[PDB]
Scaffold this motif. Structure first.
Motif, PDB file in Angstrom:
ATOM      1  N   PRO A 140      -3.576  35.780  21.433  1.00 51.32           N
ATOM      2  CA  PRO A 140      -3.527  34.331  21.224  1.00 51.32           C
ATOM      3  C   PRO A 140      -2.321  33.755  21.914  1.00 51.32           C
ATOM      4  CG  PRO A 140      -4.104  35.453  19.213  1.00 51.32           C
ATOM      5  CD  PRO A 140      -3.552  36.494  20.142  1.00 51.32           C
ATOM      6  N   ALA A 141      -2.440  32.512  22.362  1.00 52.82           N
ATOM      7  CA  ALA A 141      -1.332  31.839  23.037  1.00 52.82           C
ATOM      8  C   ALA A 141      -0.090  31.723  22.140  1.00 52.82           C
ATOM      9  CB  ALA A 141      -1.756  30.446  23.536  1.00 52.82           C
ATOM     10  N   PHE A 142      -0.287  31.481  20.847  1.00 46.81           N
ATOM     11  CA  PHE A 142       0.856  31.363  19.936  1.00 46.81           C
ATOM     12  C   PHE A 142       1.691  32.644  19.917  1.00 46.81           C
ATOM     13  CE2 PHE A 142       2.842  32.075  15.800  1.00 46.81           C
ATOM     14  CZ  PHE A 142       3.709  30.977  15.788  1.00 46.81           C
ATOM     15  N   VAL A 143       1.015  33.784  19.787  1.00 48.43           N
ATOM     16  CA  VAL A 143       1.691  35.072  19.745  1.00 48.43           C
ATOM     17  C   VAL A 143       2.413  35.360  21.066  1.00 48.43           C
ATOM     18  CG1 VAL A 143       1.441  37.537  19.283  1.00 48.43           C
ATOM     19  CG2 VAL A 143       0.050  35.880  18.021  1.00 48.43           C
ATOM     20  N   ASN A 144       1.780  35.025  22.182  1.00 46.23           N
ATOM     21  CA  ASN A 144       2.398  35.204  23.493  1.00 46.23           C
ATOM     22  C   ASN A 144       3.700  34.407  23.507  1.00 46.23           C
ATOM     23  OD1 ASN A 144       0.437  36.811  24.790  1.00 46.23           O
ATOM     24  ND2 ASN A 144      -0.755  35.011  25.451  1.00 46.23           N
ATOM     25  N   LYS A 145       3.639  33.173  23.021  1.00 47.60           N
ATOM     26  CA  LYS A 145       4.812  32.317  22.995  1.00 47.60           C
ATOM     27  C   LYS A 145       5.890  32.823  22.043  1.00 47.60           C
ATOM     28  CE  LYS A 145       2.573  28.151  24.679  1.00 47.60           C
ATOM     29  NZ  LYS A 145       2.215  26.731  24.382  1.00 47.60           N
ATOM     30  N   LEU A 146       5.501  33.252  20.844  1.00 48.53           N
ATOM     31  CA  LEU A 146       6.442  33.781  19.858  1.00 48.53           C
ATOM     32  C   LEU A 146       7.179  35.026  20.383  1.00 48.53           C
ATOM     33  CD1 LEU A 146       7.517  33.650  16.887  1.00 48.53           C
ATOM     34  CD2 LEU A 146       5.609  35.149  16.257  1.00 48.53           C
ATOM     35  N   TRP A 147       6.430  35.966  20.962  1.00 49.94           N
ATOM     36  CA  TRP A 147       6.995  37.211  21.501  1.00 49.94           C
ATOM     37  C   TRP A 147       8.002  36.893  22.619  1.00 49.94           C
ATOM     38  CZ3 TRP A 147       7.690  42.118  20.443  1.00 49.94           C
ATOM     39  CH2 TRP A 147       7.854  43.074  21.462  1.00 49.94           C
ATOM     40  N   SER A 148       7.635  35.912  23.428  1.00 50.90           N
ATOM     41  CA  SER A 148       8.447  35.483  24.534  1.00 50.90           C
ATOM     42  C   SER A 148       9.740  34.848  24.048  1.00 50.90           C
ATOM     43  CB  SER A 148       7.643  34.509  25.396  1.00 50.90           C
ATOM     44  OG  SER A 148       8.429  34.004  26.448  1.00 50.90           O
ATOM     45  N   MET A 149       9.645  33.924  23.088  1.00 61.35           N
ATOM     46  CA  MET A 149      10.849  33.247  22.580  1.00 61.35           C
ATOM     47  C   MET A 149      11.818  34.127  21.800  1.00 61.35           C
ATOM     48  SD  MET A 149      10.096  30.683  19.332  1.00 61.35           S
ATOM     49  CE  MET A 149       9.231  29.393  20.183  1.00 61.35           C
ATOM     50  N   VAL A 150      11.289  35.003  20.939  1.00 58.45           N
ATOM     51  CA  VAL A 150      12.138  35.874  20.121  1.00 58.45           C
ATOM     52  C   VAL A 150      12.886  36.917  20.984  1.00 58.45           C
ATOM     53  CG1 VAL A 150      10.379  37.623  19.449  1.00 58.45           C
ATOM     54  CG2 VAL A 150      12.257  37.130  17.889  1.00 58.45           C
ATOM     55  N   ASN A 151      12.277  37.301  22.113  1.00 60.77           N
ATOM     56  CA  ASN A 151      12.872  38.294  23.013  1.00 60.77           C
ATOM     57  C   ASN A 151      13.741  37.706  24.127  1.00 60.77           C
ATOM     58  OD1 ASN A 151      11.812  40.500  21.572  1.00 60.77           O
ATOM     59  ND2 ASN A 151       9.913  40.466  22.760  1.00 60.77           N
ATOM     60  N   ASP A 152      13.733  36.390  24.287  1.00 58.14           N
ATOM     61  CA  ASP A 152      14.549  35.768  25.325  1.00 58.14           C
ATOM     62  C   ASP A 152      15.960  35.531  24.780  1.00 58.14           C
ATOM     63  OD1 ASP A 152      15.713  34.106  27.292  1.00 58.14           O
ATOM     64  OD2 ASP A 152      13.784  33.226  27.775  1.00 58.14           O
ATOM     65  N   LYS A 153      16.931  36.280  25.309  1.00 55.58           N
ATOM     66  CA  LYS A 153      18.345  36.199  24.877  1.00 55.58           C
ATOM     67  C   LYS A 153      18.939  34.797  24.925  1.00 55.58           C
ATOM     68  CE  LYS A 153      19.162  40.981  26.508  1.00 55.58           C
ATOM     69  NZ  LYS A 153      17.758  41.175  26.990  1.00 55.58           N
ATOM     70  N   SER A 154      18.368  33.932  25.751  1.00 48.80           N
ATOM     71  CA  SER A 154      18.858  32.562  25.828  1.00 48.80           C
ATOM     72  C   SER A 154      18.556  31.794  24.516  1.00 48.80           C
ATOM     73  CB  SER A 154      18.247  31.840  27.039  1.00 48.80           C
ATOM     74  OG  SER A 154      16.828  31.778  26.978  1.00 48.80           O
ATOM     75  N   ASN A 155      17.695  32.363  23.665  1.00 52.16           N
ATOM     76  CA  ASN A 155      17.323  31.721  22.399  1.00 52.16           C
ATOM     77  C   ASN A 155      18.066  32.345  21.232  1.00 52.16           C
ATOM     78  OD1 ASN A 155      15.278  30.152  23.735  1.00 52.16           O
ATOM     79  ND2 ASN A 155      13.874  31.877  23.551  1.00 52.16           N
ATOM     80  N   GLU A 156      18.848  33.383  21.508  1.00 53.63           N
ATOM     81  CA  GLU A 156      19.582  34.147  20.498  1.00 53.63           C
ATOM     82  C   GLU A 156      20.283  33.389  19.369  1.00 53.63           C
ATOM     83  OE1 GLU A 156      22.863  36.891  21.965  1.00 53.63           O
ATOM     84  OE2 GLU A 156      23.823  35.556  20.494  1.00 53.63           O
ATOM     85  N   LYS A 157      20.916  32.276  19.712  1.00 54.09           N
ATOM     86  CA  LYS A 157      21.627  31.461  18.737  1.00 54.09           C
ATOM     87  C   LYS A 157      20.675  30.860  17.734  1.00 54.09           C
ATOM     88  CE  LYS A 157      23.026  28.915  22.047  1.00 54.09           C
ATOM     89  NZ  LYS A 157      23.467  27.726  22.831  1.00 54.09           N
TER      90      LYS A 157
END
Length: 88
Positions: free
Chosen positions: A3-20
């Motif tokens: 699903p697109a949501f899961v693709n997006k969630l996996w992408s955001m949680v693993n992108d270090k730029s979102n760490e904060k």
């Protein structure tokens, strides 16, 4: 397909730029959003054109993720840690 949501969630949680704003717990078991407001303001728009936290949590719930309510009422509210129902 995934699903697109899961693709997006996996992408955001693993992108270090979102760490904060959103990150896996150090154990790698839960997803932690330290502050709802910052996340909604700085991260959400990057992945969902017009969304909001309620929409985000509704999608999380469908895939087994939950913010366990373990604090008595009246006894913060900005920190959101998600744990999944599905265990090993």
């Amino acid at each position: 397909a995934r699903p697109a949501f899961v693709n997006k969630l996996w992408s955001m949680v693993n992108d270090k730029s979102n760490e904060k704003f959103i990150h896996w717990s150090t154990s790698g078991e839960s997803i932690v959003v330290p502050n709802r407001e910052r996340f909604v303001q700085e991260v959400l728009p990057k992945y969902f054109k017009h969304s909001n936290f309620a929409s985000f949590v509704r999608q999380l719930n469908m895939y087994g993720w939950h913010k366990v309510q373990d604090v008595k009422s009246g006894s913060n509210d900005s920190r959101w840690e998600f744990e999944n129902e599905r265990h090993a």
